[PDB]
Write a protein that binds this ligand. Sequence first.
Ligand SMILES: Nc1ncnc2c1ncn2[C@@H]1O[C@H](CSCC[C@H](N)C(=O)O)[C@@H](O)[C@H]1O
Ligand SMILES: Nc1ncnc2c1ncn2[C@@H]1O[C@H](CSCC[C@H](N)C(=O)O)[C@@H](O)[C@H]1O
Ligand SMILES: Nc1cncn1[C@@H]1O[C@H](COP(=O)(O)O)[C@@H](O)[C@H]1O
Ligand SMILES: Nc1cncn1[C@@H]1O[C@H](COP(=O)(O)O)[C@@H](O)[C@H]1O
Ligand code: SF4
Ligand code: SF4
Ligand SMILES: [Cl-]
Ligand SMILES: [Cl-]
Ligand SMILES: [Fe+2]
Ligand SMILES: [Fe+2]
Lengths: 520, 520
Amino acid sequence: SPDFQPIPSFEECFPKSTKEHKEVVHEESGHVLKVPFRRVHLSGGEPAFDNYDTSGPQNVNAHIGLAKLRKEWIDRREKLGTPRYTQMYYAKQGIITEEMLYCATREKLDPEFVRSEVARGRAIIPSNKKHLELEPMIVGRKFLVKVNANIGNSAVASSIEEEVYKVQWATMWGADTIMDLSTGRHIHETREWILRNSAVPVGTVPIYQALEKVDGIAENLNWEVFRETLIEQAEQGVDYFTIHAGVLLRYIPLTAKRLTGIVSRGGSIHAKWCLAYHKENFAYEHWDDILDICNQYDVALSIGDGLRPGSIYDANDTAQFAELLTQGELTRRAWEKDVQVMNEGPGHVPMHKIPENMQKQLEWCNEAPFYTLGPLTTDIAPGYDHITSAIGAANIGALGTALLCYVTPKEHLGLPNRDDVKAGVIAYKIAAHAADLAKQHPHAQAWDDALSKARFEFRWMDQFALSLDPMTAMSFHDETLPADGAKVAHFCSMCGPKFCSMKITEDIRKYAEENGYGSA
Amino acid sequence: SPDFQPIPSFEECFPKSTKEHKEVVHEESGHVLKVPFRRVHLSGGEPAFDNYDTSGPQNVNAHIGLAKLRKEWIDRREKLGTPRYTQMYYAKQGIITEEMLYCATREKLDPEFVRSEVARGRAIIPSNKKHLELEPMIVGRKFLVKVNANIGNSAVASSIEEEVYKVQWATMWGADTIMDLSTGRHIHETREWILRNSAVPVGTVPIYQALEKVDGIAENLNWEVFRETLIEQAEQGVDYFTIHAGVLLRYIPLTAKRLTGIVSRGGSIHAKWCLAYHKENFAYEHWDDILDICNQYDVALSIGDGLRPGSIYDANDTAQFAELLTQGELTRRAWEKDVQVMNEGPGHVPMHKIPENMQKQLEWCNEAPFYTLGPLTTDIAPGYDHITSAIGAANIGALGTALLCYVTPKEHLGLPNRDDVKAGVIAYKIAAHAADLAKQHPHAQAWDDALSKARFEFRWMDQFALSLDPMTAMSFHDETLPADGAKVAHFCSMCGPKFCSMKITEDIRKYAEENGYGSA
Ligand SMILES: Nc1ncnc2c1ncn2[C@@H]1O[C@H](CSCC[C@H](N)C(=O)O)[C@@H](O)[C@H]1O
Ligand SMILES: Nc1ncnc2c1ncn2[C@@H]1O[C@H](CSCC[C@H](N)C(=O)O)[C@@H](O)[C@H]1O
Ligand SMILES: Nc1cncn1[C@@H]1O[C@H](COP(=O)(O)O)[C@@H](O)[C@H]1O
Ligand SMILES: Nc1cncn1[C@@H]1O[C@H](COP(=O)(O)O)[C@@H](O)[C@H]1O
Ligand code: SF4
Ligand code: SF4
Ligand SMILES: [Cl-]
Ligand SMILES: [Cl-]
Ligand SMILES: [Fe+2]
Ligand SMILES: [Fe+2]
């Protein structure tokens, strides 16, 4: 019974917003789905602006956990009977599931389009049947670009209470998925509390706990230990597993001349084991057995990039792309068993090398969703790697990357705290939305337009309410002009009343009203 | 006699760094030039790492001002006699000036290459002969990407003391130029203190003070008022003027259907005057007279973009590109009189629209240096516009933009303070360097490689010392591991000792020492 403390309220974080749900009926089952969104209430005769909402149910006691909203969906499918439980299996049968309709509604797209994307392997809906608390979401290039927030303890830092806070906090600010990457104490328990209290998909990297199960002795890992860890985590409801099955024995020497070696945590663990025994990666060898596990729960596979580059020097090297080729093989094998797959990508990559990454992944991995860690576009600014990587994430997102794993200001320096989690999520929501705009994703610009209209019209509170982080925008403005009257002033302190360009435009257009721009 | 207060010392900001100078001789004159750089002193047998340095002379009493290092250069050229005083004039005569050699040295490139770039109009060296305190620098696509920091008061906020602090502070963190954009009290005096204490080029937007000279009544502007303002500012040493001479009367109606209208401060002032009189822009009409002024001092012209887009909605519209076409005409006219020119660019531009901006500017403006305000890649995150725009700035920098005007976290909200200035400069140094890497600019990656080598080798203090902001990186690490011993630990709190991937790689390579990767 951890001493859980509440995050700041939705209302504190998003003034003028309300949580809403769109009700739709899943016709085959008759199940009524309540698909979340937020509504930003505006002034001056503007219609309210509806936006995406990952924050999940609010004010729920963490000792009790979230409502098991998917229970009737899972129970009905079990009673009907099925050989496999994955969204890809259902999609290939021509079945539109509750999860697919929920995602279609959430994305403002057709349910058949969702089904098609999942069936062809170009989108995934990470949704383990044991994660009944989940509000379904979809990851794929044809959908909104999504953001993952990484949390979890280490042996050096944090606690159960703080990690649960961090999941609620990450999702408040826009995280679409989270991963519990705990490598310290109480791994199982920490994850249980998180899953029961997470409305978003939860991923893990099972090799971390497997290594803990053998007391940090990598040589004592093997398939059997790993298999038991997979089943344990699947039973709790983990929606996706990062598995570094492309770190093949023969690829390891390709890293010998790298500047920063193997920087992947899981990748380095597999490499250590492979070298210790001179034997092929056991997750690769047992790929089919992993697929059998995934089929029973619907755990999606996030095929790791254990040989990703950890420095600009190492970007796009032979080791990295050898693994990418194998990720594609593993992807196609998974699809033969109807297991949902995404592929993990780099890393530290300078901007001119970003296009090659997307081109090769799209081709070699048959358009499976891509899931990048950034990339960081330069190594020079630890303390600011949310910015160095927002540049790369936005770029690779624009080229088609479906899920952007965040990077916080603590990257390369220490375990992120709750403040760093917020900073990382905001930077990544910026990158993801900038990518949506670059892709001309339907209706993405409506958000920018609503805020910009409020800006031009000096509807200051509306401007703040429409932004990613309303209280930051408001407090920043108020540092110089805190008075209530300034919230309707046609200027701010940047230019002052006589040099505000939008006020000058306002006067210009007023002058032009009577007959136009043609008279003195 | 303002109450000037010192910025934190170079040593506080950059532990393990020293300010150094490379001495070179200007052969025609015999003048000895002392070209600044910094040297980062490293451990473990690494050679010291030399980097660029804009911070200028340190610990100089602002009441006294900086040494007039260029005095002998200017005096000698005056004694020789010349019809025009610009670096472009000298370059076209085949003359390598002190300024050109200084820049060549600072860029590690050949002085003839610098001369060629300036002569052809593809680079500028903003260096008014009255700014004797200036350490010369070059702006151009063939050189390091540069950053401008905007400072200055408004009628609502700040003071002379604070603005001088901000210039010293901006340059400490890497600003390559600054602009004094004051629109409040004491404009002339504020600028005088800044120029006498600035080792970097100082730009202004003369129409702001011209409008102040006529008490904010735009209708009382005219060429004569503007001309007197130009001469006043030139006499003080302003190195470049933003002049919105492309805001033509006939382009103004093209803005009528824009979401955010005319967002340029200077552009809106010119538009108001043009509409008031139904007369062509007086700066356009008197372009030749402006060139005559610039020739006598070497003031470079930064041709404004008064019709830049101020929202994603307005990006790449007819008004914006009409002005760009005119900027090209004005550029070619300026070159006929040997006046140095750069062109100002957008703005708010979504990523997919960035390439068109560069393509049209390179063609229509004959490769003159481009100088962008960002661009911001989305409107959704006021409070974080240093990040929304770092993405655009890095992108457009990669495509060839030579000078990136910073955007601080206070953009759209209020006047930036000293903290915001630092945040903006750091974000922009990231964008500029990421662009240098993307362009494969010679030796740019050496910086990333040195930091990444320190990272892999757990030379923590070296890693911090090599970064853009050493004390931030150090303090962030120390939030979880503050002990001195942690500065040599082969892990940090992110992974802890047993999950650090670089330590695992370290052990892996140690194992492989005896004979290789082929044995169990
Ligand atoms: N407990 C945790 N909380 C938040 N992020 C974590 C985490 N454990 C691992 N991560 C993420 O996983 C990464 C692996 S450790 C270092 C990886 C390396 N910097 C690289 O370039 O890939 C971390 O840097 C962090 O981004
Ligand atoms: N005194 C000052 N200090 C710092 N930046 C200034 C400044 N005066 C003007 N600026 C810069 O010039 C801009 C003009 S005012 C608003 C411009 C608008 N946001 C746009 O998209 O172009 C400011 O936003 C700021 O970026
Ligand atoms: N998204 C991504 C791409 N490459 C790595 N990651 C993420 O990085 C984390 C740690 O992975 P690893 O064990 O490979 O270092 C996990 O969150 C994983 O999804
Ligand atoms: N670099 C740039 C490109 N477009 C505008 N700017 C900068 O924006 C500021 C204000 O310009 P304006 O008067 O056009 O709003 C000046 O610093 C100018 O160089
Ligand atoms: S004063 Fe300047 S920064 Fe403030 S609202 Fe007006 S145009 Fe924007
Ligand atoms: S513990 Fe993880 S984050 Fe820290 S130095 Fe090692 S690899 Fe990097
Ligand atoms: Cl690291
Ligand atoms: Cl604004
Ligand atoms: Fe890294
Ligand atoms: Fe703007």
